[PDB]
Design a protein around this ligand. Structure first.
Ligand SMILES: [Cl-]
Ligand SMILES: [Cl-]
Length: 162
């Protein structure tokens, strides 16, 4: 298992514009297009992201290309974030993937706001971080996915995903 497979399970793959858990227009493997309520606005963002006139539908390859850029962007965002970097540097392979999953979902600023959990992870206090992680809007709105990520930090294995 790896980060790509992990997020492909968490996000699914949809080749037509759809609304995510929050009601925002998205496509592919969790690629957010826009927070605007306008479909045309989404379609326009989509065309600009793909580079062709899509009419709201993309191909598998096109979805995978957005996904690659999004994963790379999340890794690079962690590495540039003064708050996230040290956490990431301190973690093992599997757990690094869990951190990337969170940033991909909520963005770096969002994850950087989990001060206590970040500190707990850095300290390798797995069970404590897991409980703290669960006291969040994140966990309350998307509990099944949250539980999978939380299990991954707690255990350091991919068990939640097999
Ligand atoms: Cl883009
Ligand atoms: Cl969920």
């Amino acid at each position: 298992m790896n980060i790509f497979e992990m997020l492909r399970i968490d996000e699914g793959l949809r080749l037509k514009i759809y609304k995510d858990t929050e009601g925002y227009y998205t496509i592919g493997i969790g690629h957010l297009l826009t927070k605007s309520p306008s479909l045309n606005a989404a379609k326009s963002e989509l065309d600009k992201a793909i580079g062709r006139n899509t009419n709201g539908v993309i191909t598998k390859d096109e979805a995978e290309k957005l996904f690659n850029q999004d994963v790379d962007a999340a890794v690079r965002g962690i590495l540039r974030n003064a708050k996230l970097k040290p956490v990431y540097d301190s973690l093992d392979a599997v757990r690094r993937a869990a951190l990337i999953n969170m940033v991909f979902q909520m963005g770096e600023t969002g994850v950087a706001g989990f001060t206590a959990s970040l500190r707990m992870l850095q300290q390798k206090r797995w069970d404590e971080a897991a409980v703290n992680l669960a006291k969040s809007r994140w966990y309350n709105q998307t509990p099944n996915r949250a539980k999978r990520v939380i299990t991954t930090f707690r255990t350091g294995t991919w068990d939640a995903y097999k």
